[PDB]
Amino acid sequence: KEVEQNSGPLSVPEGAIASLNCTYSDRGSQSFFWYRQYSGKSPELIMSIYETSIKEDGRFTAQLNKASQYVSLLIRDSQPSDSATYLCAVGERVGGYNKLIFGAGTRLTVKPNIQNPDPAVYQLRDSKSSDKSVCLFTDFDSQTNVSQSKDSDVYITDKCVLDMRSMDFKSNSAVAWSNFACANAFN
């Protein structure tokens, strides 16, 4: 293919270096770009590079080598908020530099560093009615992953990382409910 990237998905612990690579077939390529695309959002251009060189922007390093036909993107001190699909894009020479060819994309997941795990299940009451409730499994380490429901009458969501930026605290959680005891629901 004309533009090829790391297959992915790619998993990296918070704090580590995420390494993304892109090879391209046309030695006459001149314009190289890295796009980030959050789930349900549009691609955003985060780096552009035009010469054999290394270009730094904050935690991001792009490196192009025209002679070897590759371009790379390094993310240092990876954060959960970096979790996204990263796309390599090259201006297509054939046709007169008139469009982009995009690689398949690399899905990066940055797993949070839970520094004080306190796993637990809680039950929460509906603000309006007193009869309805849900179950909250939270404060679990990032190596834990949730089994989806077995009873078509129980709903269990996937885990979700939330960031209380004001406190340097992140936490994983999943929710369960049904039309049922909470202590049990997540086994």
Partner: peptide
């Protein structure tokens, strides 16, 4: 801040 909504 402090929010996480299921991706799907």
């Amino acid at each position: 801040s402090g929010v996480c909504t299921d991706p799907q």
